Design a protein around this nucleic acid. Structure first.
Ligand SMILES: [Mg+2]
Ligand SMILES: [Mg+2]
Ligand SMILES: [Mg+2]
Ligand SMILES: [Mg+2]
Ligand SMILES: [Mg+2]
Ligand SMILES: [Mg+2]
Ligand SMILES: [Mg+2]
Ligand SMILES: [Mg+2]
Ligand SMILES: [Mg+2]
Ligand SMILES: [Mg+2]
Ligand SMILES: [Mg+2]
Ligand SMILES: [Mg+2]
Ligand SMILES: [Mg+2]
Ligand SMILES: [Mg+2]
Ligand SMILES: [Mg+2]
Ligand SMILES: [Mg+2]
Ligand SMILES: [Mg+2]
Ligand SMILES: [Mg+2]
Ligand SMILES: [Mg+2]
Ligand SMILES: [Mg+2]
Ligand SMILES: [Mg+2]
Ligand SMILES: [Mg+2]
Ligand SMILES: [Mg+2]
Ligand SMILES: [Mg+2]
Ligand SMILES: [Mg+2]
Ligand SMILES: [Mg+2]
Ligand SMILES: [Mg+2]
Ligand SMILES: [Mg+2]
Ligand SMILES: [Mg+2]
Ligand SMILES: [Mg+2]
Ligand SMILES: [Mg+2]
Ligand SMILES: [Mg+2]
Ligand SMILES: [Mg+2]
Ligand SMILES: [Mg+2]
Ligand SMILES: [Mg+2]
Ligand SMILES: [Mg+2]
Ligand SMILES: [Mg+2]
Ligand SMILES: [Mg+2]
Ligand SMILES: [Mg+2]
Ligand SMILES: [Mg+2]
Ligand SMILES: [Mg+2]
Lengths: 208, 156, 225
RNA sequence: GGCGUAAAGCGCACGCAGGCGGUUUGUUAAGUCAGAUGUGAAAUCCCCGGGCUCAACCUGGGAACUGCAUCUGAUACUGG
RNA sequence: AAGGCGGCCCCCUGGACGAAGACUGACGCUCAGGUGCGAAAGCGUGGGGAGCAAACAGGAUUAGAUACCCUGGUAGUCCACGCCGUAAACGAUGUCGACUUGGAGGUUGUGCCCUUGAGGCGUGGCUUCCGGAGCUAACGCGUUAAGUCGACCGCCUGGGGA
RNA sequence: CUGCAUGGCUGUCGUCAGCUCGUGUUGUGAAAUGUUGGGUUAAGUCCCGCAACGAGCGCAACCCUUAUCCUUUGUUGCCAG
RNA sequence: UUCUUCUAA
């Protein structure tokens, strides 16, 4: 358990929280359950949508869910068709009036949750894991990432001895605190077990 | 237009403090179907990366071989470090009669009629060096005529 | 184009002692006076003039010439000769793989330009002044090594070497790439790696100026033609 | 094919039999080389054919049987 | 020749080398079997016996200590004459001959320059170190070859068993 | 039930200064060089040298806290006048 | 000064 989580260590410096609200201790853990249930529901519902980061914010007892996705067309559908379907079930879960905003993800090859899920979706339909890791790195360094490191782990190709492998291209400074390391993690539930995928993407140093 | 053949891939090792580090070596030879022959030996952590380093070095340092019609010109011998190698010009359409690593280097050499035998150690790295060394000092009827200072017809 | 008493006054016939000489230099040594070999200038002149003709041959078709000498006594003279006929020089240490591993040194040629651009032309004063000296000593170091070839861009077409064994690394890189080699091959050097061998002294400052000016002429004479 | 270190130079030396032998001329013709003759059974193998509807098979002619003997030469080499 | 040879003196005695000639005229090289030599240890007979020292004894050390360490100590070591015939008897490289770039030495002759100093220029023998080509699995060898060849001999054929 | 089918997470060597790659070169090859040497540093830290030239992960800095000053704002905090 | 040994895949 050597390495710190690169998102959680940068949360005061260059990364924002995925939930930015306030409550006292009386109403804290109910909100944190309320934030958890909608991230649970939307991830299950928008699985085919390439959703990356669900940002939750609640002013004045009214939740505002900001969905980041690579394509909003499958999230919206017709104009106020699926978003309005998803808005009324958030209000059932959160118990407050809801609001869904959609921020489009330019360059989905440079977003760690999308890249990790692309590797997972490829690994689930039984592709060669090494081929999937090459194309995930080549697409990001072409699109302009200053450095990407991907990593799969355990039970690769149904081999009984589970091992981990990782590729790296460009510089990925994890110890630099002002480094924009986009880090997120996916899991592939293959027929031979569970393959965990990690991906680090370095965009550049924020000079605050 | 340069046909490319890998002869053998091999996994080597290197023991460090953490344990064994594995690596892969690749022995490839290229050729144009004529006297331009060249081999390469690459090495990397991964098998497709190792053949690519081998194909890269094989495309330069080519060597030129004065062939006959489709065969060699005189029975020549070649040695390198474990492998004395005999090869012989042969009649038309008898095929490449050659062993293992020697088959791959003569096929991209553009010969088609050889009678070969690899004596000694048949390690693919040294026997592919022994044929290239064997083919390089093979001399033409033109080369011996200019050297001895006679015509081709006085040599017959 | 250079007479024998030109060579005899500068000290081309001088060499090294009898405990340092190479037996391959036997067709070029005349005799041995005061335990120092004497270079046969009867064979120096028609071979050095055969070499200057090929310089006039290669620099006619706009070939690139690289001067190679890092003897730390003839370091300034090999720079001044290359700036006369505006060709390329190596006065401080020949980097291992400067020709064969050109594609990595190319990534330092571009770095040499950007450090000269940023500080001199870009005028990037008022930065963190310890890095401002780190920018300075970087540009000082790269100009000291790659400044003589920073406008060359590609591989040269002929190589002029001051010493055939002191710059033996540059001989091997030229032998791989098929580039012809011009070298002052002294008695303590190896005359096999040089494509056009020129006998002569190596430590004589007068002879270094004598050798280079005969080359700095036939490049300028070869450039206009 | 090997023998410093992988199996392998006798601990060293003298020396009989044996193997080998500088250079020049003459002679010899033993070796050697060439030719011829005799012989090397047939079958078999090989080549070109022929015959069984093809093939296996059968068969004509040839080459081969690389040997040995005798004779006629050749004289560089080796021997005398 | 190998084993080997160490104060000094004498007697007997083998070999090498050099300088110039003179002379014999292939008289040579190698060698199974054979014969001779052959360290130390050992054996036989007869001496000798200071020191050293297997064996053995005592002391320590140690879990034990038939060892290392200590104090003693006998064959032995020494001489004469025989025998044994073996060693990592090694350069782990059989002998003889020819050719093939160099450098720094050691030793031992000999010629030459005015020895104008122990110097200058050569020319032989033997020897040490480094190293090029070449060779070699590599290490390395490298004009004293493990390079390039010739003549003859000895020997090898998986590890044990042996 | 199987941590000896795994993911995730953690100890540990060890906050030890190390660990590697690209191209080049050397070696038939395993590999080597770089990364060694001279100094120096907490540090593969830096400088010089060098068949290496570069780059990456780390050793450092960027972060938090503490240590002095300034400006701004003074209640539920403060009391010199 | 003395200071030994460690099986299983
Ligand atoms: Mg931690
Ligand atoms: Mg074998
Ligand atoms: Mg054998
Ligand atoms: Mg042994
Ligand atoms: Mg042996
Ligand atoms: Mg012997
Ligand atoms: Mg005998
Ligand atoms: Mg004779
Ligand atoms: Mg005769
Ligand atoms: Mg006869
Ligand atoms: Mg006859
Ligand atoms: Mg028929
Ligand atoms: Mg018959
Ligand atoms: Mg005769
Ligand atoms: Mg007489
Ligand atoms: Mg004898
Ligand atoms: Mg005795
Ligand atoms: Mg007894
Ligand atoms: Mg006795
Ligand atoms: Mg007695
Ligand atoms: Mg006594
Ligand atoms: Mg005692
Ligand atoms: Mg014995
Ligand atoms: Mg001895
Ligand atoms: Mg000795
Ligand atoms: Mg022996
Ligand atoms: Mg040597
Ligand atoms: Mg040999
Ligand atoms: Mg020999
Ligand atoms: Mg040998
Ligand atoms: Mg475990
Ligand atoms: Mg685990
Ligand atoms: Mg347990
Ligand atoms: Mg089990
Ligand atoms: Mg490398
Ligand atoms: Mg190589
Ligand atoms: Mg290291
Ligand atoms: Mg290393
Ligand atoms: Mg150092
Ligand atoms: Mg560093
Ligand atoms: Mg026991």
């Amino acid at each position: 358990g050597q390495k710190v989580h690169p998102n959680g260590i940068r949360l005061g410096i260059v990364k924002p929280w995925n939930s930015t609200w306030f409550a006292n201790t009386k109403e804290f853990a109910d909100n944190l359950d309320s934030d958890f249930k909608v991230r649970q529901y939307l991830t299950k519902e928008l699985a085919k949508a390439s959703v990356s980061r669900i940002v939750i914010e609640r002013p004045a007892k009214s939740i505002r869910v900001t969905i980041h996705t690579a394509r909003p067309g499958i999230v919206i559908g017709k104009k106020g068709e699926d978003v309005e379907k998803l808005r009324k079930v958030v209000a059932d879960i959160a118990g407050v009036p809801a609001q869904i905003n959609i921020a489009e993800v330019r360059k989905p090859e440079l977003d760690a949750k999308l890249v990790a899920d692309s590797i997972t979706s490829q690994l689930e339909r039984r592709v060669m894991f090494r081929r999937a890791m090459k194309r995930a790195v080549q697409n990001a360094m072409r699109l302009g990432a200053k450095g990407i490191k991907v990593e799969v782990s355990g039970r690769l190709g149904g081999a009984e001895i589970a091992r981990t492998e990782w590729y790296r291209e460009g510089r990925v400074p994890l110890h630099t605190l002002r480094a924009d390391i986009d880090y997120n993690t996916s899991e592939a539930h293959t027929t031979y077990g569970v393959i965990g995928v990690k991906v680090w993407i370095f965009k550049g140093e924020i000079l605050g | 237009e340069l046909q490319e053949k890998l002869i053998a891939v091999n996994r080597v090792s290197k023991t460090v403090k953490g344990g064994r580090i594995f690596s892969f070596t690749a022995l490839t030879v290229v050729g144009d179907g004529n006297g331009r022959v060249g081999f390469g030996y690459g090495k990397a952590r991964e098998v497709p990366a190792a053949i690519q380093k081998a194909m890269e070095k094989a495309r330069r340092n080519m060597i030129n071989v004065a062939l006959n019609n489709g065969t060699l010109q005189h029975p020549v011998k070649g040695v390198h470090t474990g492998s004395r190698v005999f090869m012989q010009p042969a009649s038309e359409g008898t095929g490449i009669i050659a062993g293992g690593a020697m088959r791959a280097v003569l096929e991209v050499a553009g010969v088609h009629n050889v009678l070969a035998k690899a004596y000694g150690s048949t390690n693919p790295i040294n026997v592919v060096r022994a044929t290239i060394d064997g083919l390089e000092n093979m001399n033409s009827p033109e080369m011996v005529a200019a050297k001895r200072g006679k015509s081709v017809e006085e040599i017959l | 184009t250079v007479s024998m008493r030109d060579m005899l006054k500068a000290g081309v016939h001088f060499g090294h002692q009898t405990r340092y000489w190479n037996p391959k230099m036997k067709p070029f040594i005349f005799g041995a006076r005061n335990k120092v070999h004497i270079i046969n200038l009867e064979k120096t002149v028609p071979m050095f003039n055969e070499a200057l003709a090929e310089l006039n041959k290669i620099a006619s078709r706009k070939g690139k010439i690289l001067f190679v000498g890092t003897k730390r006594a003839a370091s300034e003279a090999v720079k001044d000769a290359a700036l006369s006929c505006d060709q390329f020089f190596v006065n401080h240490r020949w980097l291992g793989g400067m020709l064969t591993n050109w594609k990595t040194v190319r990534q330092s040629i571009k770095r040499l330009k950007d450090l000269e651009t940023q500080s001199q032309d870009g005028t990037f004063d008022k930065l963190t002044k310890k890095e401002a000296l780190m920018r300075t000593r970087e540009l000082e170091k790269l100009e000291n090594s790659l400044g003589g070839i920073k406008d060359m861009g590609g591989l040269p077409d002929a190589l002029f070497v001051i010493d055939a064994d002191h710059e033996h690394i540059a001989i091997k890189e030229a032998n791989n790439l098929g580039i012809p080699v011009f070298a002052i091959v002294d008695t303590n050097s190896d005359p096999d790696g040089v494509d056009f061998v020129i006998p002569g002294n190596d430590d004589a400052i007068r002879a270094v100026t004598l050798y280079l000016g005969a080359v700095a002429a036939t490049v300028r004479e070869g450039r206009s033609q």
